[model samples]
Target: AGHMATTKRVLYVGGLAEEVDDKVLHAAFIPFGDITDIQIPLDYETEKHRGFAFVEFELAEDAAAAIDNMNESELFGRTIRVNLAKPMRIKEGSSRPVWSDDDWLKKFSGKTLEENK
Candidate 1:
């Protein structure tokens, strides 16, 4: 049924500077596409972001593009990590995610781009 949908509209971004707000995060991804909702986890008491967020784009293509482009972009004076927003229910009986392997970093090593021509 998920495939029947034209596209989902959600993304998960992390590595924020703990000061970035929803508005600033939204503006960061506006160049990619239309954003419908931007949510940053906040400290219930301080009302400050906890260094991560969820942004819902009007289209999934835009969300993917944003994630690819912003995975390691400098934001709020720190490099931010962006990815799809995975839905998870946090409860005492819920199961935690099991990582398959740590070899994924192989894709990142020595693959850093050289900007100079």
Candidate 2:
């Protein structure tokens, strides 16, 4: 409940093709505004580009425009989803259960589990 409002100058782009890279994203988004950085994480084990990226713009308006115009737009034959980047937050004394191994087992505990196996 302590989240503070901040300027949103960064955007998250998802549903990217495996071949999409920083260069491609830069080319696609440069028309919107001055991009400070474009980051596409790589899978640690395979060293391949992850299917999403974070783009930082010099101005928050540019990021908003990018999200409005580029969201659900096709790029490289895939529909992309764009939104403002949200910071990780863990609420104090939160009881939200995460999907751990034990949680998964408990969730799937039913007669259907045996049939699926």
Candidate 3:
């Protein structure tokens, strides 16, 4: 049998400004839930920001809520894109994700709030 688990505890945040730091991110997301950690990757050589971040929440529900509310929202003078974090793997593949506003609405359109809780 094949087994898989989906985690909504971590979010992949993109379109971050070079000056967006952990503190700024924490301030924005702290209202959603308890945050476990945040990682804004840096350019090793130049020590500059890598323009993206990973924010971890203590609860999956919080992460999902953040994704729903924050995606395409403006932050730090940039429109930020938020989504569930996908693990990176080394493989011979060139595929990429295709996400859109319609996709988010379609995914949660019919679901009741009680169903999510």
By TM-score, the best candidate is: 3
Give lDDT tens digits, candidate 3, residues 1-117: 011145566667888899999989999888888998887765647898766777888887878789888999999998998876443321121222354323332333333354574
Model 1 residue runs over 4 Å out of place are 1-8, 87-117
- Per-model C-alpha RMSD: 13.9, 10.3, 13.3
Worst 10 residues of 3 by lDDT: 87-96
- Which stretches in model 2 have alpha-carbon errors above 4 Å? 1-4, 87-117
* lDDT tens per residue, model 2, 1-117: 222254456667888999999999999898988899887766658898657777888877777788888989998898998865542221122322232323222322321354574
Q: What lDDT does each candidate get?
A: 0.62, 0.66, 0.68
- Compute the lDDT of residue 79 as modeled in candidate 2: 94
Give the clashing pairs for model 2. none
Candidate number with the higher TM-score (1 or 2): 2
Count of clashing residue pairs in every prediction: 0, 0, 0
By lDDT, the best candidate is 3
